Enzyme design. Structure first.
Site, mmCIF file in Angstrom:
data_model
loop_
_atom_site.group_PDB
_atom_site.id
_atom_site.type_symbol
_atom_site.label_atom_id
_atom_site.label_comp_id
_atom_site.label_asym_id
_atom_site.label_seq_id
_atom_site.Cartn_x
_atom_site.Cartn_y
_atom_site.Cartn_z
ATOM 1 N N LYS A 176 1.442 2.595 -7.933
ATOM 2 C CA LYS A 176 2.470 2.769 -8.963
ATOM 3 C C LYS A 176 2.885 4.205 -9.179
ATOM 4 O O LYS A 176 3.273 4.591 -10.281
ATOM 5 C CB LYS A 176 2.035 2.150 -10.287
ATOM 6 N N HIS A 200 -3.373 3.184 -0.518
ATOM 7 C CA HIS A 200 -3.734 3.601 -1.867
ATOM 8 C C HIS A 200 -5.208 3.995 -1.869
ATOM 9 O O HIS A 200 -5.790 4.331 -2.908
ATOM 10 C CB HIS A 200 -3.516 2.469 -2.865
ATOM 11 N N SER A 249 3.206 1.725 -15.905
ATOM 12 C CA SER A 249 3.744 0.998 -14.782
ATOM 13 C C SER A 249 2.740 -0.036 -14.257
ATOM 14 O O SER A 249 3.126 -1.154 -13.909
ATOM 15 C CB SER A 249 4.148 1.985 -13.695
HETATM 16 C C1 LIG Z 1 -0.440 -4.922 -4.436
HETATM 17 C C2 LIG Z 1 0.169 -3.886 -3.330
HETATM 18 C C3 LIG Z 1 -0.623 -2.552 -3.301
HETATM 19 C C4 LIG Z 1 -0.633 -1.937 -4.784
HETATM 20 C C5 LIG Z 1 0.933 -1.586 -4.904
HETATM 21 O O1 LIG Z 1 1.468 -0.412 -5.600
HETATM 22 C C6 LIG Z 1 1.656 -2.946 -5.414
HETATM 23 C C7 LIG Z 1 1.716 -3.676 -3.959
HETATM 24 C C8 LIG Z 1 2.418 -5.158 -3.928
HETATM 25 C C9 LIG Z 1 2.632 -5.628 -2.426
HETATM 26 C C10 LIG Z 1 1.167 -5.895 -1.809
HETATM 27 C C11 LIG Z 1 0.319 -4.531 -1.869
HETATM 28 C C12 LIG Z 1 -1.140 -4.761 -1.239
HETATM 29 C C13 LIG Z 1 -1.082 -5.406 0.234
HETATM 30 C C14 LIG Z 1 -0.091 -6.633 0.359
HETATM 31 C C15 LIG Z 1 -0.933 -7.901 -0.206
HETATM 32 C C16 LIG Z 1 0.469 -7.032 1.718
HETATM 33 O O2 LIG Z 1 -0.007 -6.883 2.814
HETATM 34 C C17 LIG Z 1 1.838 -7.702 1.474
HETATM 35 C C18 LIG Z 1 2.030 -7.667 -0.060
HETATM 36 C C19 LIG Z 1 1.235 -6.360 -0.327
#
Ligand SMILES: C[C@]12CC[C@H](O)C[C@@H]1CC[C@@H]1[C@@H]2CC[C@]2(C)C(=O)CC[C@@H]12
Ligand SMILES: C[C@]12CC[C@H](O)C[C@@H]1CC[C@@H]1[C@@H]2CC[C@]2(C)C(=O)CC[C@@H]12
Lengths: 267, 267
Positions: free
Chosen positions: A43, A98, A128
């Site tokens: 975020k 991250h 956020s």
């Molecule tokens: C939660 C997140 C990582 C934390 C982010 O700021 C919000 C993102 C949403 C999309 C997610 C991602 C992690 C890995 C995922 C699950 C994928 O590989 C496709 C959708 C992806």
């Protein structure tokens, strides 16, 4: 129901992430020198950055960027989907992460891969995250704003402590292959920031290409599993009570003391 | 359901108040010179003040004060009950009122009755009113904190604008029969404040009487129709968001401009 993947002291989304894969990301994933990587505490503005790098690649044409998803154009190395994609993808690769430094691919610290680390005012990051995660299914959500706030200051949230995440990566702020950016400079002066990214990556651009990119990568442009399909508001000041702000300040100062205050552009 | 007694531009509790009586308070009620009156915008510390004046009367013995109710020991002239009591009560009389100056008994401005006006940081007043009124039956309550906040800044609440209430009475701050006190000086230095009240009223006290009074009239001591029998928390900073504080500041400054900022002890 614990509701989270506890791995090596860090919490993770229950779905899309397996312990085993995490162990590989660190121990086996191979970072190529040609790689370009976006490092961010969740975020902090990953998509904007990511979207900018794709625009710089397509030289302005936002059709692929429009058709292809974020997770496709710049996959999360730590995720099942992404870890898979990245592996069988032709260099040069653009991906995001991250992950705090102690869990990042070991191969990275021996490479010449270019990393852009984007940080943002933690207060906004907290706001956020609250409104994002509480709108995600299969994810331990907070009983209330008061609770989440407490979680964040304790680092008990997904991906752990923000302060921790920051401290770990800061010792790299002066490496040649490491560009430290602030979400605030990205939103305040998108062009100067695009200029920096351009030199850091060593990419040149024709005037008209820059104009289109600058166009397609503005705060206006940018603005465009879910518990509530509806949401699919303001600033952090619209959410922290005066007491939380003072407590937060006191906390930020106690934990970021060993760092040049002037690294963090926000008041 | 409107849920309030609209009278001469000011809102009033639906019960215990009749328009007719209000018209009398202004036009007929007779103020005696021997009268001692507590003027306050609701939730500014009336009971503490009232309790102090009763202690000064009983010279410390808090048994009557303990047995008799607030509304009995110092009735609200504007109320049915009180207006009745005050009328058939032997001088000297001690009563209270939240009435703005343009609705106060006309006989008052010709008298020598002593008035103690107590004001308090409006932010606390707002917080205190919210948690009080939303716990009272038969009273238009706010949909939320955000709404009430808006009401208060607009003066749309019971007894009207705080700013108005303050502006009206301030021109009397220098009359000999008018003592202006702050809730903040009352809580910070109860003794000095009791000293002021003592000179203003012209009441002397034996050392041991003052000690008992000081004892029985401390913040510790003080701390001791309802929608929720249960409630029958913090400071304003625990409730205003940072944005409300800044907006409130800006508002306070715009409306209290024509007054010496140094009248209001709060930051
Ligand atoms: C939660 C997140 C990582 C934390 C982010 O700021 C919000 C993102 C949403 C999309 C997610 C991602 C992690 C890995 C995922 C699950 C994928 O590989 C496709 C959708 C992806
Ligand atoms: C609401 C209030 C005046 C506004 C105060 O800060 C809260 C007080 C509660 C007690 C009320 C009083 C108005 C007049 C009443 C109705 C009486 O005469 C007895 C009970 C009294």
């Amino acid at each position: 129901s614990d509701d989270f993947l506890w791995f090596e002291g860090i919490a993770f989304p229950t779905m899309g992430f397996r312990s085993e894969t995490l162990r590989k990301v660190r121990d086996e994933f191979v970072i190529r020198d040609e790689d370009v990587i976006i490092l961010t505490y969740p975020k902090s503005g990953t998509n904007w950055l990511a979207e900018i790098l794709c625009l710089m690649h397509s030289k302005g044409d936002a059709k692929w960027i429009q058709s292809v998803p974020i997770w496709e154009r710049s996959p999360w190395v730590e995720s099942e989907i992404g870890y898979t994609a990245l592996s069988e993808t032709e260099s040069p690769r653009l991906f995001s992460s991250h992950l705090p430094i102690q869990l990042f691919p070991k191969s990275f610290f021996s490479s010449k891969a270019k990393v852009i680390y984007l940080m943002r005012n933690p207060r906004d990051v907290l706001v956020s995250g609250y409104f994002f995660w509480k709108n995600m299914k299969f994810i331990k959500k907070p009983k209330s704003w008061e609770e989440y706030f407490e979680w964040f200051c304790q680092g008990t949230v997904l991906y752990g402590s923000w302060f921790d995440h920051i401290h770990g990566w800061m010792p790299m702020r002066e490496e040649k292959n490491f560009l430290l950016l602030s979400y605030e400079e990205l939103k305040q002066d998108t062009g100067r920031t695009i200029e920096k990214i351009c030199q850091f990556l060593g990419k040149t651009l024709e005037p008209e290409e820059l104009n289109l990119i600058l166009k397609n990568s503005s705060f206006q442009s940018m603005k465009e599993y879910v518990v509530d399909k509806t949401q699919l508001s303001g600033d952090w000041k619209n959410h922290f009570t005066v007491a939380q702000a003072e407590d937060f300040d006191k906390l930020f100062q106690e934990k970021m003391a060993d760092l040049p205050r002037e690294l963090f552009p926000w008041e």
